[PDB]
Symmetry: D4
Subunit: 235 residues, 8 copies
């Protein structure tokens, strides 16, 4: 299968809420992305509705032509919402910045099972850590998403090749356990290739860099450009 590109449109809302108006609208951004090479759309519903709102999730769930990846923390509230919303994907995150699955095997087991019961495919956001990965496999998540943050912030060309290698070994380890593996968070037009080249990678969920390119060149080209780089890497 072709590498997939999930586009996170949270920052479209960031720009909206810096002024209370209705624009720009994440609903429009999603149509653009789904038609410029995005295979999925990701929104992070935060408990403080600061940036994405219940409305966005509500309409988005009716307007998306592909599928939603709802990013949320593991709280009673969010789980409740997710089960009602029935997103195709759910990515659990904290409130290096990865979920501490290994340290909460019960809570995560309960969440995965529950979301799974609502027909939601679950992804645990975690660091390139085999303990955490082993833990995720064990609690029942069909997916994990490796935090590419440290890799993006690689101050030195060395720290980077090092970070890349850790992610790669982590992914291969994740797949041997039967997990499908995503990445994203921090990837840019300049560092996406090494990650896209990792064979075990299933989908890359990228947000900020794309929105940052969009204010300059427009969303359509920004999304197309990212996808193209991704497929260049694989070929």
């Amino acid at each position: 299968a072709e590498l997939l590109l999930g586009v996170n449109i949270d920052h479209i809302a960031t720009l909206r809420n810096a002024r209370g108006t209705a624009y720009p609208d994440p609903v429009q951004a999603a149509f653009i992305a789904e038609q410029a090479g995005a295979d999925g759309i990701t929104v992070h519903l935060r408990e403080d509705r600061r940036h994405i709102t219940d409305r966005d999730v509500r309409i988005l769930r009716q307007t998306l032509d592909t599928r939603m990846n709802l990013e949320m923390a593991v709280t009673e509230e969010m789980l409740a919402i997710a089960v009602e919303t029935k997103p195709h994907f759910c990515c659990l995150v904290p409130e290096e910045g990865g979920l501490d699955v290994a340290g909460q095997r019960d809570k995560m087991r309960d969440a995965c099972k529950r979301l799974a019961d609502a027909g939601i495919q679950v992804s645990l956001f975690i660091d390139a850590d085999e303990e955490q990965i082993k833990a995720a496999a064990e609690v029942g998540a069909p997916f994990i998403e490796i935090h590419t943050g440290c890799y993006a912030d690689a101050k030195t060309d060395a720290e980077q090749a090092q970070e890349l290698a850790r992610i790669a070994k982590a992914a291969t380890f994740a797949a041997s356990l039967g997990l499908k593996v995503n990445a994203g968070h921090g990837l840019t037009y300049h560092n996406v290739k090494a990650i896209a080249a990792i064979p075990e990678m299933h989908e890359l969920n990228i947000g900020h860099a794309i929105i940052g390119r969009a204010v300059m060149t427009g969303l359509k080209d920004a999304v197309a450009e990212m996808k193209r780089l991704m497929l260049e890497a694989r070929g």
Copy 2:
């Protein structure tokens, strides 16, 4: 003279700071705008550096091909900065949301004179209020900028025509006193024309709506589109 369009790039930074990276960069946005129909660039330096930073102002002041309109509150800090920076324009604002010039004739007189002494053309941000306008004329500002906020938020087609009329009478009053008059703040692609049609209008400083259009269509077209609407109104 042709109506002028000043583009406020504050929100380019809003989108930048929602992630600490270097992008998107307001310096790039300014080149794009200055070449797509913007006659001036406006940045608001806030005391909490939340969104635009000293760096932006510093580089921008060297990279702008047209001129800077530095938007700031009337504090010792800001005045200090402005005098050092030597912006071509300075727009004083509060910390309907207009400066209370009438109620602070001394502070404003001191500020205007001081900025004027640094060769800075001053603009007082105020409501469509003849008392405030008379006050501004009297304290020495060569410019005022009428807050178009209430007009943009006109809930009813009636409240709007009403708000438009107040702005228009206010402008004509401002000019009789020898003031040059700007507007902007809240204007959109759908309400810019009635304001652009007001003859006394010198420059419209527009920010949010343009950045909101840009994430969809790119900055170049967003700026060009606004300018075109503006010149359609006048002709």
Copy 3:
């Protein structure tokens, strides 16, 4: 202000329901048109829900940046719907081609009354007929939309200039009664100007021609094109 353009997006949905999939989606088309020169979006909710659906209207009502013009037949169902939807405009059409206001003064008078209590501004779609126009004015409707179908259909240059004269004359008469007047049905890229040249015209609501240009050229350009011909006509 300037001549307005309302884009009817009904045919986006007729292309959708020809296959029962979710695309194309009227919600997307509305975003595009509103950002390319449309001042309003028109949807006709048929009783058989042939093309537009209650879903489209529901979402559309929350996503439009400008204003919705609901096109509907005068029936208990539609009135109740219009009342709860609270569209900014409601254009009453038949269940030469226009509504028979003269022959149903009672129905129409109450209809307008009922919609006006819900804040909806009513427009009666009628023929370039002085009797119907006078009747419309008498039932209290604030708007009338003149059916330009025959003008469009005109098979000979003469039959066209004639239908044109008949329309201009009607527009003038309706305005003499305090009626604000629209038109647009059947208008094309090649015949829109003469109509747009009529001074009393407030807004042209066009659909088919635009969507038909769109499949070849894209909605954005199709809309900007029409908008430009219209403003050219008044220049």
Copy 4:
């Protein structure tokens, strides 16, 4: 190895025949598609001539630069027209949705031979069923077109990888019997790749998704996008 794209322009006609004007014209759509990556144009001449008309087929036959793929039901009327027109291909269709070749070996036997004597390369529109494939081979048709509708409608990932498997097996089966195999019908920008990667696939005939993308982006980019996805799948 070099996948061909056949664009079905039927829906261009549905949009036109919703108004009774000459636009949009299928003849224009074909020129665009043929120059944007289409290798053939398909038109379905229905009995009720609701969408595509005799005129279309007649001019299309003289304007096409590549070749026509005439979709029709097996009747004396349609068969008569086919032999008259001399389309390069003829795709027999019912008027799982597939054509029943097994249950009519004689009708089909005659149809194919008749069309064959007229120089028409015949293709039988069938379901991914071993029975029908064997029938088509035995009956003498050079081509079969596997119905992908079920694969497109598959609600879940698993129900999809399943339908994909059936099609891939059916294509390999078809090929071993000396049959050339096409598909398309239901393919979209989001599911087309998995079908394109099927080695045996000769040509994918696609319509609805392309025309639906076209009302937003324009026919050329719509057709060009699809062709590009297809070649990437084989690359």
Copy 5:
């Protein structure tokens, strides 16, 4: 009123017959221009069928969305074809270069009357010469098209102003005889305006300069740019 643009697509066919292929096809050129500024399409059916052919004319007559202007020499053949084809316009040309109406008053008189009974508006392609204009008025032709070749070939800027003047006086003279007047032969992007500013001008029929620009920029912009220059001239 509106200055119209008729695009002569003859040279598209010229480019075709230089290889006896089907491309480029005039039927396509015609769709492009009609959607990019052309108000009409002109084709010269030469007796030897050098450039345009009978099929061109026949299909064109069914595909044109605006109207056809059939250029032809005066011979029973062409007339019969014309009467048969019922093109909206017929511009009689010779096969200075203008049609000699004075020297053939009888023939033309029959032609005009003849074509006029079929319902075809006739125009006589003539030189900016009074004898020929009076001649065309006497004969009953509703239109004349002034040959702009000598103007287009105007070597010096004086020899050129001579031609302009000569064409302008001739146009006013023609109008004074109840004739409607066109022009267009040899007009280019750099000389069209002076001619378009002539008040009496009803439609400019241009071919060569446009096709010549189109090879570089593409037909769409070549047409749109010419229409744009014309409207600028009359503003």
Copy 6:
């Protein structure tokens, strides 16, 4: 190695001389193509100077950024011109359609040697016929260009595969004699790939199909699209 594309701009001049103007100018067409995928430019200086003229050749020789391929008949005139012009390449053509080298072994032998001393690489335009290939090898020509006309005219899909095969075997045969081989005459957007996939192909010289596409889309994309199809073929 890299499959090269030589664009024959003859038909640009064809379009020019159809009016004896200066536009369109081949010198311009040449800049466009060289920057859009052409690795060379080909011009056929016909003895009667029908299409291309001496100035064309003369200026072109000073403006081309890549290299010239002068097509010409074998006569003392052309040779002298060639020897004078020092074009990088010279493709000797007749004035099946291929050059008859067998029947003129002597003449060609002198031509090749003659042009070769001026430092001009020579290529003989011949049919996919062994007698002529052996002939061209014997005579000393370093290149041959296989005429692809019969292939391009391939009415049936069989008559076509016959030509492909015939060209492929001929190319391998030519290579086995130490000859380098080109092709290109009559190749289009829909048939170029099969020819480009032939391993022995060194450069495809194409003209007509490109100019034909360019009238619609503009030269730049016409060239870029052809080069793109070619690289796809060899990948």
Copy 7:
């Protein structure tokens, strides 16, 4: 009333002559500019032939579709070349920066007459000074080109409205003496309008700003932008 744009392509050559390759070629730049709204092309042939060369002028003279404006100093060499080349215009320049006509009435008297006998329309590059204007009139030159350099360099708004006043008076003065007046030299996208609005202005010759915009956006849009600003100023 219809302002002409003259594009100076000198800087295209400076960029080339910084490397000693054939690119970028002024010949290409001229084709683009002439088709993007330029009415003439200017080239300054300098003694040191540092930028523009003899070759350029030589080919330019044969490729231009509009006309050449040869900029040169008054010397026997340059004058000799002018008479040989026969440029449409010749703009005499020094090699306030303006040409001293007053202080050399004889040289200029002869130069103009000589160029005049060669058919060259002469223009004297002078400062906005009453003395020089009178001299140019008395000396016999048909044109003068007012140096706008000082107006472009004006540091402050007031110093600018001042220089603008001097130019406008000088142009009206020049016109009353029967002189045709041009400008340009220093104009930019940001100051061009005020100069364009000057009624008397015949042609603005611009170079640097346009080429500087061109390296970012491309020559065509650069030239098209400038022409559009100019016409808006007169509109």
Copy 8:
């Protein structure tokens, strides 16, 4: 990872300093290139500050998103500058064309040492010379950039293939010494591939050709174009 592209923007400034204005601005060009395929930006700070200035470098150092490659002569001035600027890369060039490392082992050894202490990664620009390569490796430099000038200049196909072989061979040898190798000087759109095909190449730093394409076409496309040819070469 993949072959990198470094864009030298020196010529943007050479177009600027040809007039002393502020445009075009290298800072803008850098943003464009970095977003169109450039992986690095190269600036050559000459001692005479002919084109690039200390200002450009200072700002550029704060605005680049990727990494700066400072090109400089080995002198006390430049070293101190490089040391305080801390560019990611420093490419040492002369004050065949490359640096004489073999003959200045001491200077070079210390230079590298000094720059490496400031964290700068050093590259020595040298000829495809085994002696210089070996010397470079011995002085401790981590990179070498092979001068491709002669390859570029090659006047004959043979002289080119030869210079090519010489370069490939050198690259291989340098890599055998642990040296990472770049190239790019003089590379064009027509000769870049053969070079990019060399496996050891790490990054191509190209300038003139790109800027020269830019004035015609725009920097963005110029850069994306080059980047695409490069990756095509490695495909």
